[PDB]
Every structure is written in C-alpha cells, then in structure tokens.
Amino acid sequence: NCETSCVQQPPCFPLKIPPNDPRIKNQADCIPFFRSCPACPGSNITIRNQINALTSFVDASMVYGSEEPLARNLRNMSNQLGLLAVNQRFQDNGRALLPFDNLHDDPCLLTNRSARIPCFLAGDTRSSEMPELTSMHTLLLREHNRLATELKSLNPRWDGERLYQEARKIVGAMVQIITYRDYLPLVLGPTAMRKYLPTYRSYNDSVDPRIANVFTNAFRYGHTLIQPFMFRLDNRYQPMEPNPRVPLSRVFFASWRVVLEGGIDPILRGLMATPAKLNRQNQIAVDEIRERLFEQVMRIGLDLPALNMQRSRDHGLPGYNAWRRFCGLPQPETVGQLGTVLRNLKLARKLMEQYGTPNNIDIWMGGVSEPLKRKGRVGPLLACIIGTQFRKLRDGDRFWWENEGVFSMQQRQALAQISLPRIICDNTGITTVSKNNIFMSNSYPRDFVNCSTLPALNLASWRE
Amino acid sequence: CPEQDKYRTITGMCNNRRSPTLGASNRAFVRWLPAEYEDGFSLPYGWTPGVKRNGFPVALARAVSNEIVRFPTDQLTPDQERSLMFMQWGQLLDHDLDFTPEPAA
Ligand SMILES: *[C@@H]1O[C@H](CO[C@@H]2O[C@@H](C)[C@@H](O)[C@@H](O)[C@@H]2O)[C@@H](O[C@@H]2O[C@H](CO)[C@@H](O[C@@H]3O[C@H](CO)[C@@H](O)[C@H](O)[C@@H]3O)[C@H](O)[C@H]2NC(C)=O)[C@H](O)[C@H]1NC(C)=O
Ligand code: HEM
Ligand SMILES: O=c1[nH]c(=S)n(C[C@H]2CCCO2)c2[nH]cnc12
Ligand SMILES: *[C@@H]1O[C@H](CO)[C@@H](O)[C@H](O)[C@H]1NC(C)=O
Ligand SMILES: *[C@@H]1O[C@H](CO)[C@@H](O)[C@H](O)[C@H]1NC(C)=O
Ligand SMILES: [Ca+2]
Ligand SMILES: [Cl-]
Ligand SMILES: [Cl-]
Ligand SMILES: [Cl-]
Structure with a gap:
C-alpha cells in the first residue's frame, strides 16, 4: 500500500525526501506514489508502456464514459427520453446534480466526515477532484438532458437510444468547438496555432489519433494556472459570504461543498470573474498543490509538480533535449545556451545545479520553465507537443464535427453559434456571463453581458 | 466494423x-520517442541508489520542486488576459483525453 508506507517495492515508487525540506523534516518519510499499470504485466520482452483508459477523441467521454457498462449505468433507463441519470437525493435550486458513486473507500466522505457526501459518478472517475471540475461536469450533464428534451419535442417518434446518441453527438461537437475555436488559440498563441493546427481540410485515416505518452505529462502545464483558492460569487458577482475564498487544500474531493454550500452557480461565477494564475519563471506553481495536495484524504500532503516529474520517470519519458530535438528546436548543452533558450540565466543556473545536464531536465519541468509564446500560455516546446497532439485528434477523427457526413451543412452552421457562456445561460441560474472569448474575459462587469443578448443553439435542422 | x-x-x-x-x-x-528506463525496459530513473542518468545523478523530484517551483503565494501574478475558466476547461478537456490507471491501494 503505497499510500501507507515508504517501502520501494512494486507497485510503489515513493518520492525520496531531500535534506532541509521546507515541510517534510524526516528524510525517511516520502511522498506516496503508485507506478502506472503496465500494458504487459510481468513481461521480460516488452519495453514498459502505460495504458490510456479513455478514448483519445475529443468526444465528451468524460460525460458519457469510455466503457459500455459504465455508459449504460450513467443513463436513465426508467424511460425512453434518452437522458443521463441525475442525483436522486439532491438538486441545486431545482436543477440536476450528478448521481453519487459507490466507492468502497470514498475519499469525498473524508473531506467532511459529518456531511456524509460521497463522490459523484460521471464518465471519468476524477469528476469530484475539485468542485470547479464537478461544476463543469454537472453543466455538461444538464446540457445533454436539455438537448434530449428539445430533440424529443422536435422528433416525438425518436426512442431513448436515438435521443441519447443525438444529444451525445451535439455535446461532443460543443466540446470540440470550444476547445479548437476558443481554448487552443489562447494556449498556443497565433504563431504556433498556424504552424501546428492549420485549417481543417478533411479526415485522414492515416493520422494516428492516439494520445502520446509524453502528452499525459506535457498537458500538465495547466497546473501552473491554478489559483490557491476556490472563488465563489453571488448574483451580483460579489464575494459570497461567509466562505468566498476557500483554500484549494480544503476543496479536493469536497463534493459536500457542491451539495451543501450553494451549488454550481457560485463556482461558475468565480471561474468566469476571477483571473487565472499567470505562469512566471519565478512563480511556477502554488503551495496549495506543491505542499498540500489532497491533504484531507492522504496521510501527508502531496506535491503535484514533484509527482509530475516522478511520473515522467515512471513512464520512461526522455528528458528536455530529446523532446527539443523531436520538435526541431535547438538543444542547449551549456548553462549559457540554456540561459539564452529560457531568456533567463538565473533559472538556467538553478536547472543545471539540480539536473547537471539539460538532457536530464524532466519534460514537465523544462516545458513550464520556457518563456511563453506571444499571446500564448506555453513556450515553444509545449506548443509543439500540445499542437501536434491536438492536430492528430482532429485530423485522425472520423467523427470530427466538420468531417463530411457527420453533420449536415445546416447543423454545422447552427453548431458554429455555440459558446460556453450560452451553455451556462441555458443550464443554470446565472443570467450575466462573460463576453466571448470566455477564456480571456475575467473582469466584472467590463467583460460581462446578460444571457438575453446571446444566441441560442438552433435545433431546427435536427427535425428528421 | x-x-x-x-x-x-x-x-x-x-x-x-x-x-x-x-x-x-x-x-x-x-510513443513519439523510445522509452528511457534505468535498465532499458522497466525500472524508472531514481529506482536504484547510485545509478546515474546520462552521466549525472538523478535529481529528486521533491528537491527540483523546492528549488525551482516553490515561490511565496502572496507574490502570485493574476493573468489579466485569462480567466480561471481557462484553467478549468484544460483539466476538463484532459479528462476527455487521458487517464493513466494505477493499482488500487
Ligand atoms: C495523411 O496523413 C499522413 C500522416 O501525416 C503526418 O501526421 C500528421 C499528423 C501531420 O504531422 C503531417 O504533417 C504528417 O505528414 C500523411 O502521410 C505521411 O506523409 C509524409 C510525406 O509523404 C510521409 O513522410 C515520408 O517519409 C519517408 C521516410 O519514411 C520519406 O522518404 C519521405 O520523403 C517522406 O518524408 C509520412 O511517412 C507519412 N506518414 C504516414 C503515417 O503515412 C499523408 O500524406 C496525409 N494525406 C493527406 C491527403 O493529407
Ligand atoms: C484542481 C485542479 C487540478 C488537480 C487537483 C490536478 C491533479 C492532478 C493529479 C493528482 C494528477 C495525477 C498526478 C500523478 O502523476 O501522480 C494529475 C494529472 C494530470 N493533470 Fe492535473 N490537476 C489539476 C488541474 C489540471 C489542469 C488545469 C490540467 C491541464 C490543463 C491538468 C492536466 C493533467 C493531465 C493531462 C494529467 C495526466 C492525466 C492522466 O492520468 O493521464 N491538470 N493532475
Ligand atoms: O489525473 C489524475 N488525477 C487524480 S486525482 N488521480 C488519482 C490520484 C489518487 C492517488 C494517485 O493519483 C490520477 N491517477 C492517474 N491520473 C490521475
Ligand atoms: C429519470 O427521468 C425521470 C424523468 O425526467 C426523473 O423523474 C427520474 O428522477 C430520472 N431518474 C434517474 C435515475 O435519473
Ligand atoms: C462540514 O459540514 C457541515 C454541514 O454538514 C458544515 O456545517 C461544517 O461547517 C463543515 N465543516 C467545515 C470545516 O467546513
Ligand atoms: Ca474522449
Ligand atoms: Cl484530477
Ligand atoms: Cl448571475
Ligand atoms: Cl511519447
């Protein structure tokens, strides 16, 4: 049991503690770590590789599931309405919450013992990890059920299976549009967006759409964006009293905060009206994840940036320079060359002191150290890894929303009008939302508009 | 099919x-690149005491975090051009793309 001991025996790979650690004073202690499961257990032939339990496609599998039994259990089978099952005990001001899961060792139950609120059941197992994530999961659940309801009115002869699949098809395209239209340009910047994601031409069945092992670590760049608090705002977008700023170490797996502390509306308002944390070379990641990650459900607070680095080793990932070469980017050998690459010699000196050679810098560490591309939130290396991955997921997807035959021309035209602020408008009590782009907009009331000014998705071309 | x-x-x-x-x-x-393991096929770098990676000692992920990642939270620079929703969509999106299983405790 990797959570209870510091013994380095399978499947454990504990993180060793350095001397003079600011928190863990006992060098015999460790940060818990379970090695990712191998694709070929106990093999003496294979080069160890890890498994992706999910579909690589941007297909909203985090809502629907990536396995047939779970996908069935997430559905409401009591009728022919094609709905996803909702919570049978609680509702958020008359609106649906995710069903509860049935885990033998429920970590949500530990975040507040007296509250007795278990983790939620969704398409992906991490839905309850933070209430901001749960809110996003809940929002997509209500959107599926809202689409299924309107599709039912439009097509009364559609059975449950047809209604579920058609609403599921819509939700997936909505995730694809928001990701590629709004999210990714703000991650990569215009230069890397043009290079790694050129205009979609057509589906190409020779493009491998699998998630690359390195992407599982490189996409953890988002840990640098994490604020140390969960921010909750009322209908006036003012701090919701008495707990408007909850430390993140007290929200991990805290499903009780959604259920018993005001629902998803204060959480969504906080997300839209609070700025993200800027990644700076001297301000990489906050102590809420670096010192106190999962503090309430673990014997010791985890260190997320350290886990990312131990994970890249567990996954046998090449170091910084091998990934630089892969991307056709210069590979610095000296501290002066590293300094030029990072436009920061002081940081280059610290990396050389820790690693000895830039060849050994762990991919997450070197990736997040790089200065950010103009109008982007990653440097050249992460932009190449992330850009390449999202190009393969788009081009190698037969069900990509713009691929011919997936949607009619009229449905594609209707889908181009969708936006995340509209989904918030349609499924919550929030009546004032961010102006497009929602991922840029962050200041109330300057960046905010009333829901009534926003175009709704026109389902007319879904009438059979 | x-x-x-x-x-x-x-x-x-x-x-x-x-x-x-x-x-x-x-x-x-x-895999976009061949894997690099201490034994070439399974053991991760840092598993065996004294075993070096490419001529250098394996740095403890915790020490790398203390020396390079650690910063005073009061100094936090809010992004004037990004909302917290930008962070949240990224985690939500990652969860559509990949989950690497581990054995139960
Ligand atoms: C359909 O897509 C495949 C794969 O495309 C590749 O991956 C994408 C995600 C992007 O990164 C693309 O830029 C990239 O090409 C295309 O096939 C690939 O085409 C190239 C060019 O012909 C092939 O490279 C060749 O490799 C040999 C050595 O092995 C050299 O001798 C050649 O000179 C050349 O460099 C590449 O191997 C090939 N890959 C596969 C998987 O087939 C394909 O062209 C594209 N089709 C259309 C219509 O767009
Ligand atoms: C509230 C915000 C976030 C977390 C809490 C959180 C936590 C983790 C943890 C604990 C893991 C597993 C770490 C380990 O190797 O031991 C993890 C993995 C991944 N994240 Fe994390 N994350 C939060 C937030 C983000 C954001 C905003 C991300 C991207 C923009 C992001 C990405 C990832 C990815 C891709 C992984 C690997 C997932 C896998 O199992 O394949 N995270 N995060
Ligand atoms: O993205 C991920 N988020 C969480 S919370 N986990 C689970 C935690 C529990 C202890 C070990 O890891 C993951 N395991 C693999 N990937 C992830
Ligand atoms: C199924 O749908 C009906 C009608 O909307 C609803 O009353 C019921 O609570 C739902 N059941 C589940 C398990 O979601
Ligand atoms: C735990 O939950 C109860 C409600 O059941 C709440 O009153 C209490 O304040 C919570 N504890 C903390 C520390 O927030
Ligand atoms: Ca998916
Ligand atoms: Cl998570
Ligand atoms: Cl409001
Ligand atoms: Cl890889």
Whole structure:
C-alpha cells in the first residue's frame, strides 16, 4: 500500500525526501506514489508502456464514459427520453446534480466526515477532484438532458437510444468547438496555432489519433494556472459570504461543498470573474498543490509538480533535449545556451545545479520553465507537443464535427453559434456571463453581458 | 466494423476502420520517442541508489520542486488576459483525453 508506507517495492515508487525540506523534516518519510499499470504485466520482452483508459477523441467521454457498462449505468433507463441519470437525493435550486458513486473507500466522505457526501459518478472517475471540475461536469450533464428534451419535442417518434446518441453527438461537437475555436488559440498563441493546427481540410485515416505518452505529462502545464483558492460569487458577482475564498487544500474531493454550500452557480461565477494564475519563471506553481495536495484524504500532503516529474520517470519519458530535438528546436548543452533558450540565466543556473545536464531536465519541468509564446500560455516546446497532439485528434477523427457526413451543412452552421457562456445561460441560474472569448474575459462587469443578448443553439435542422 | 454508422461507439473502437483500436479506450499509449528506463525496459530513473542518468545523478523530484517551483503565494501574478475558466476547461478537456490507471491501494 503505497499510500501507507515508504517501502520501494512494486507497485510503489515513493518520492525520496531531500535534506532541509521546507515541510517534510524526516528524510525517511516520502511522498506516496503508485507506478502506472503496465500494458504487459510481468513481461521480460516488452519495453514498459502505460495504458490510456479513455478514448483519445475529443468526444465528451468524460460525460458519457469510455466503457459500455459504465455508459449504460450513467443513463436513465426508467424511460425512453434518452437522458443521463441525475442525483436522486439532491438538486441545486431545482436543477440536476450528478448521481453519487459507490466507492468502497470514498475519499469525498473524508473531506467532511459529518456531511456524509460521497463522490459523484460521471464518465471519468476524477469528476469530484475539485468542485470547479464537478461544476463543469454537472453543466455538461444538464446540457445533454436539455438537448434530449428539445430533440424529443422536435422528433416525438425518436426512442431513448436515438435521443441519447443525438444529444451525445451535439455535446461532443460543443466540446470540440470550444476547445479548437476558443481554448487552443489562447494556449498556443497565433504563431504556433498556424504552424501546428492549420485549417481543417478533411479526415485522414492515416493520422494516428492516439494520445502520446509524453502528452499525459506535457498537458500538465495547466497546473501552473491554478489559483490557491476556490472563488465563489453571488448574483451580483460579489464575494459570497461567509466562505468566498476557500483554500484549494480544503476543496479536493469536497463534493459536500457542491451539495451543501450553494451549488454550481457560485463556482461558475468565480471561474468566469476571477483571473487565472499567470505562469512566471519565478512563480511556477502554488503551495496549495506543491505542499498540500489532497491533504484531507492522504496521510501527508502531496506535491503535484514533484509527482509530475516522478511520473515522467515512471513512464520512461526522455528528458528536455530529446523532446527539443523531436520538435526541431535547438538543444542547449551549456548553462549559457540554456540561459539564452529560457531568456533567463538565473533559472538556467538553478536547472543545471539540480539536473547537471539539460538532457536530464524532466519534460514537465523544462516545458513550464520556457518563456511563453506571444499571446500564448506555453513556450515553444509545449506548443509543439500540445499542437501536434491536438492536430492528430482532429485530423485522425472520423467523427470530427466538420468531417463530411457527420453533420449536415445546416447543423454545422447552427453548431458554429455555440459558446460556453450560452451553455451556462441555458443550464443554470446565472443570467450575466462573460463576453466571448470566455477564456480571456475575467473582469466584472467590463467583460460581462446578460444571457438575453446571446444566441441560442438552433435545433431546427435536427427535425428528421 | 459496421459499414455505415452515424454515431461513435462508447470505446472509440472502429473510429479508424483500418486499425480499429486507435484512439479506443484501454490501449497502450503511442510513443513519439523510445522509452528511457534505468535498465532499458522497466525500472524508472531514481529506482536504484547510485545509478546515474546520462552521466549525472538523478535529481529528486521533491528537491527540483523546492528549488525551482516553490515561490511565496502572496507574490502570485493574476493573468489579466485569462480567466480561471481557462484553467478549468484544460483539466476538463484532459479528462476527455487521458487517464493513466494505477493499482488500487
Ligand atoms: C495523411 O496523413 C499522413 C500522416 O501525416 C503526418 O501526421 C500528421 C499528423 C501531420 O504531422 C503531417 O504533417 C504528417 O505528414 C500523411 O502521410 C505521411 O506523409 C509524409 C510525406 O509523404 C510521409 O513522410 C515520408 O517519409 C519517408 C521516410 O519514411 C520519406 O522518404 C519521405 O520523403 C517522406 O518524408 C509520412 O511517412 C507519412 N506518414 C504516414 C503515417 O503515412 C499523408 O500524406 C496525409 N494525406 C493527406 C491527403 O493529407
Ligand atoms: C484542481 C485542479 C487540478 C488537480 C487537483 C490536478 C491533479 C492532478 C493529479 C493528482 C494528477 C495525477 C498526478 C500523478 O502523476 O501522480 C494529475 C494529472 C494530470 N493533470 Fe492535473 N490537476 C489539476 C488541474 C489540471 C489542469 C488545469 C490540467 C491541464 C490543463 C491538468 C492536466 C493533467 C493531465 C493531462 C494529467 C495526466 C492525466 C492522466 O492520468 O493521464 N491538470 N493532475
Ligand atoms: O489525473 C489524475 N488525477 C487524480 S486525482 N488521480 C488519482 C490520484 C489518487 C492517488 C494517485 O493519483 C490520477 N491517477 C492517474 N491520473 C490521475
Ligand atoms: C429519470 O427521468 C425521470 C424523468 O425526467 C426523473 O423523474 C427520474 O428522477 C430520472 N431518474 C434517474 C435515475 O435519473
Ligand atoms: C462540514 O459540514 C457541515 C454541514 O454538514 C458544515 O456545517 C461544517 O461547517 C463543515 N465543516 C467545515 C470545516 O467546513
Ligand atoms: Ca474522449
Ligand atoms: Cl484530477
Ligand atoms: Cl448571475
Ligand atoms: Cl511519447
């Protein structure tokens, strides 16, 4: 049991503690770590590789599931309405919450013992990890059920299976549009967006759409964006009293905060009206994840940036320079060359002191150290890894929303009008939302508009 | 794989008709570069005491975090051009793309 001991025996790979650690004073202690499961257990032939339990496609599998039994259990089978099952005990001001899961060792139950609120059941197992994530999961659940309801009115002869699949098809395209239209340009910047994601031409069945092992670590760049608090705002977008700023170490797996502390509306308002944390070379990641990650459900607070680095080793990932070469980017050998690459010699000196050679810098560490591309939130290396991955997921997807035959021309035209602020408008009590782009907009009331000014998705071309 | 299909399978199977497990669930990740393990095939760097990586000692991930990642939270620079929703969509999106299983405790 990797959570209870510091013994380095399978499947454990504990993180060793350095001397003079600011928190863990006992060098015999460790940060818990379970090695990712191998694709070929106990093999003496294979080069160890890890498994992706999910579909690589941007297909909203985090809502629907990536396995047939779970996908069935997430559905409401009591009728022919094609709905996803909702919570049978609680509702958020008359609106649906995710069903509860049935885990033998429920970590949500530990975040507040007296509250007795278990983790939620969704398409992906991490839905309850933070209430901001749960809110996003809940929002997509209500959107599926809202689409299924309107599709039912439009097509009364559609059975449950047809209604579920058609609403599921819509939700997936909505995730694809928001990701590629709004999210990714703000991650990569215009230069890397043009290079790694050129205009979609057509589906190409020779493009491998699998998630690359390195992407599982490189996409953890988002840990640098994490604020140390969960921010909750009322209908006036003012701090919701008495707990408007909850430390993140007290929200991990805290499903009780959604259920018993005001629902998803204060959480969504906080997300839209609070700025993200800027990644700076001297301000990489906050102590809420670096010192106190999962503090309430673990014997010791985890260190997320350290886990990312131990994970890249567990996954046998090449170091910084091998990934630089892969991307056709210069590979610095000296501290002066590293300094030029990072436009920061002081940081280059610290990396050389820790690693000895830039060849050994762990991919997450070197990736997040790089200065950010103009109008982007990653440097050249992460932009190449992330850009390449999202190009393969788009081009190698037969069900990509713009691929011919997936949607009619009229449905594609209707889908181009969708936006995340509209989904918030349609499924919550929030009546004032961010102006497009929602991922840029962050200041109330300057960046905010009333829901009534926003175009709704026109389902007319879904009438059979 | 069915010759005509309007909808995705839940598993991702048959999305690519020539290689129908590509992008499907419960399959090994693709590798863009060969793996680097201490023994060449299974043990991670840092597993064996005294075993170096490319001529240098393996730095403890915790020490790297203390020396390079650690910063005073009061100094936090809010992004004037990004909302917290930008962070949240990223985690939500990652959760559509990948989950690396581990054995239960
Ligand atoms: C359909 O897509 C495949 C794959 O495309 C590749 O991956 C994408 C995600 C992007 O990164 C693309 O830029 C990239 O090409 C295309 O096939 C690929 O085409 C190139 C160019 O012909 C092939 O490279 C060749 O490799 C040999 C050595 O092995 C050299 O001798 C050649 O000079 C050349 O460099 C590449 O191997 C090939 N890959 C596969 C998987 O087949 C394809 O062209 C594209 N089709 C259309 C219509 O767009
Ligand atoms: C509230 C915000 C976030 C977390 C809490 C959180 C936590 C983790 C943890 C604990 C893991 C597993 C770490 C380990 O190797 O031991 C993890 C993995 C991944 N994240 Fe994390 N994350 C939060 C937020 C983000 C954001 C905003 C991300 C991207 C923009 C992001 C990405 C990832 C990815 C891709 C992984 C690997 C997932 C996998 O299992 O394949 N995270 N995060
Ligand atoms: O993205 C991920 N998020 C969480 S919370 N986990 C689970 C935690 C529990 C202890 C070990 O890891 C993951 N395991 C693999 N990937 C992830
Ligand atoms: C199924 O749908 C009906 C009608 O909307 C609803 O009353 C019921 O609570 C739902 N059941 C589940 C398990 O979601
Ligand atoms: C735990 O939950 C109860 C409600 O059941 C709440 O009153 C209490 O304040 C919570 N504890 C903390 C420390 O927030
Ligand atoms: Ca998916
Ligand atoms: Cl998570
Ligand atoms: Cl409001
Ligand atoms: Cl890889």
